[PDB]
Write a protein that binds this DNA or RNA. Structure first.
Lengths: 51, 171, 56, 61, 61
RNA sequence: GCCCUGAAAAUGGAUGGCGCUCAAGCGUGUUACCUAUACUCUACCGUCAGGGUUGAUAUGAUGCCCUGACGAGUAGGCAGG
RNA sequence: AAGCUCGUAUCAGUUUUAUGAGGUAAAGCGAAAACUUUAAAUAUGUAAGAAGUCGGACAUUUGAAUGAAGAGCUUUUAGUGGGCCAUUUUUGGUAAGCAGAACUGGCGAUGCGGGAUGAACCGAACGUAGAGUUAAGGUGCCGGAAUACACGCUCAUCAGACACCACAAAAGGUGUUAG
RNA sequence: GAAAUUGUUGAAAGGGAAGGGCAUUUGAUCAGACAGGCCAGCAUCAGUUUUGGUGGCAGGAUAAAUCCAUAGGAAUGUAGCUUGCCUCGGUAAGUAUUAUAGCCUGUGGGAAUACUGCCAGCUGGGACUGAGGACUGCGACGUAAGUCAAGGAUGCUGGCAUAAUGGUUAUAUGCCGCCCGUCUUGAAA
């Protein structure tokens, strides 16, 4: 009869697409990526600032 | 809107026996990306025989400023097609950044010339390091030693409709 | 007018014939222009050149 | 992608991104004072009513 | 279905035509933009903006 | 670019009025905001449509239940009262 | 409205590809722009398949996209036959107004919000109600909404609040700001 | 024994319009129902939705900047030096590249913060709605039994138990409202 929404009503969010739960544990948009110092090219920054 | 400065290059498409043409670059002022792109294609179709379908974009990069809070004298060479034939102009600003200077320019051109963003062209920004080669005067007077001046007739902006005090400015 | 259609038909039946001969997916229906993919460019033949729209 | 463009910037090169293959479209203008060819178009894309929208695959046509 | 869309896949046309045209509200925030019916390039609302649709649509959801 | 002139009548008379001048004007930019039978969500009516329905003749088969979209409208037609 | 073949199919005020009956020469290099030499654009035609392909051979990835599985044959029935405006193209022109054609859209049968009011403007898919959000237009008061923020210019001895290129109009002016 | 129309009593109104519509007040008036009707309130839940707080992430030049060091430069020239006045310390013109202030630039260092985007992240406040009617099922929690915020809202309590709400009606008030029908209907008058 009734649209019960996702994006609130977590229970029906889980009734669908149940990868949500491990999303709850691991939390997977607060995903700290491994940083790498990899510098850009000197030519690139030179054309950036100077023309 | 509130403005940004962007760096764009276009790499007009590889045709056989002329791959990788010459990466035409522009520095373009706008509030966002796609507006910037469209203006690159607009200037480019003016400047040589291109179309967007015959061209392609390399990259977009926001140009931040190197030393923002350095007060700078800028001088800008511009064109605009007002109702007449197109015509040139130079103007001079004491300001903090390139982008804010052109902001003030766009509004001042709007005042004094009824000049639209669409029909403005920038040629070029330049920054002036040494004083006393600025041509204009209205900036030049803001360059003197031991400078002081007042804020006369300061007025206070109350929320209330009544005041019970017989107000004053100060002085 | 239709000579394009006839030579297209014979090209179609030709790829039909070879695809039926050596078992492969047929994919005989046409395919339009499509969105182009990534490709690195390095500015080694020329550095990026900057422009002065005076225009004259 | 992000690693690639980072590495190309290190390399003095430039990543061109893929031209995107999907868009979303929305009807803004309503029903009337329409010219008819666009009316037929929007009947194809099901964008009849206002603030209605959909996905579309990208190609030349 | 979502993956078929975004990695626009084989069974995409069929998924899209399974799907209705989405019936959206008007924007919760406003459009911005006192006038709509110029190009977005001109400070309008129509045309091709190509990332700000996402802002627009979560407002319109 | 603004401003004055750049020609006007004759009942008293209108940026819509009031009145407005670092604007309540003019060009421009930012934001917040009011607001229509437009859009959305929901209930209700009705029509159309697709489905289910003789098991207790489950007492209306022109029934009963489920689901969905849509409704302007003269001449005119069809139908029910 | 009724049948009968079916939803097999049908097509679509649509795009893409290829193509003319023709070039706009905006390219002169193709004889010292001379040259049909054709970057195209101005759009119709055609098609994108069994209704096809070379007696006999070949099934739906069986021949582009996109949408609609409601289309077609024959029979039969009511009402209806003129007209203003706009835009696009183009011929004739006039001081000027314009006249004539062709296409298209609005109004006609049609209400609502705004435009102070309104045949032609701007927006807008009409069952009754609630709540929400907005369009066009607006926010000093009438009037619901910021006497908001901010850069400038203006001070008219009847400004302007205009819709705009448009008619007096090309100019005068020791008003004013920027070039 | 109607209606037009007229008087009389009773109710009410009224500044150059009448009646009409939407909502309500005041007044007059009125029917129903309490072996359980009328108006409301609190909590927890669901759909819809508005408005705040707050946290964690990603990106860009892996922000730019500030800030630390370093090199160089110059002035709207800081200390210092020279000359004049002298109000005996402030000018004037020279000097002087940090000194008894500092600035600009180049390189390098390591952070954070911005703007943008993401959260199947936490939390609060507000409003309207509560259709539907034994159970069926998709799901969650839990070892299970059983349970739930999962196919449309239930629990607790109070007042009144009547003209209080509600209705009808005259009327005030805000906004709206062109006089009907016909014939040409293209100032559509």
């Amino acid at each position: 009869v009734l649209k019960k929404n996702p994006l609130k009503n977590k229970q029906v969010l889980l009734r669908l697409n149940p990868y949500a739960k491990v999303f709850a544990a691991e939390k997977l948009g607060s995903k700290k990526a491994e940083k790498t110092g990899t510098k850009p090219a000197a030519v690139f920054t030179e054309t950036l600032k100077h023309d | 809107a509130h403005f940004k400065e962007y760096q764009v290059i276009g790499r007009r498409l590889p045709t056989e026996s002329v791959p990788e043409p010459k990466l035409f670059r522009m520095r373009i002022f706008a509030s966002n990306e796609v507006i910037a792109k469209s203006r690159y294609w607009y200037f480019l179709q003016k400047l040589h025989k291109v179309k967007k379908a015959s061209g392609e974009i390399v990259s977009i990069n926001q140009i931040n400023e190197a030393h923002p809070t350095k007060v700078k004298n800028f001088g800008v060479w511009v064109r605009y097609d007002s109702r007449s034939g197109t015509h040139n102009m130079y103007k001079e600003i004491r300001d903090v950044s390139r982008v804010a200077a052109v902001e003030t320019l766009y509004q001042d051109m709007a005042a004094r010339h009824r000049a639209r963003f669409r029909s403005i062209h920038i040629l070029k920004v330049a920054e002036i390091e040494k004083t006393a080669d600025v041509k204009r005067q209205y900036v030049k007077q803001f360059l003197t030693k031991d400078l002081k001046f007042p804020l006369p007739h300061r007025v206070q902006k109350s929320t209330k409709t009544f005041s019970y005090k017989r107000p004053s400015t100060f002085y | 007018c239709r000579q394009e259609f006839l030579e297209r038909v014979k090209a179609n039946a030709a790829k039909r014939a070879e695809a039926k001969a050596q078992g492969v997916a047929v994919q005989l229906k046409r395919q339009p222009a499509q969105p182009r993919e990534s490709r690195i460019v390095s500015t080694e033949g020329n550095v990026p050149q900057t422009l002065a729209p005076v225009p004259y | 992608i992000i690693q690639a463009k980072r590495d190309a910037k290190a390399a003095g090169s430039y990543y061109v991104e893929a031209q995107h293959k999907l868009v979303f479209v929305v009807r803004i203008k309503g029903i009337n004072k329409i010219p008819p060819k666009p009316r037929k178009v929007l009947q194809l894309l099901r964008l009849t009513r206002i603030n209605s929208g959909t996905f579309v695959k990208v190609t030349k046509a | 279905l979502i993956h078929e869309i975004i990695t626009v896949g084989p069974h995409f046309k069929q998924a899209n035509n399974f799907l209705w045209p989405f019936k959206l509200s008007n924007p919760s925030g406003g459009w911005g933009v006192p006038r709509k019916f110029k190009h977005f390039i001109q400070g309008g609302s129509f045309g091709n903006r190509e990332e700000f649709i996402n802002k627009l649509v979560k407002s319109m959801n």
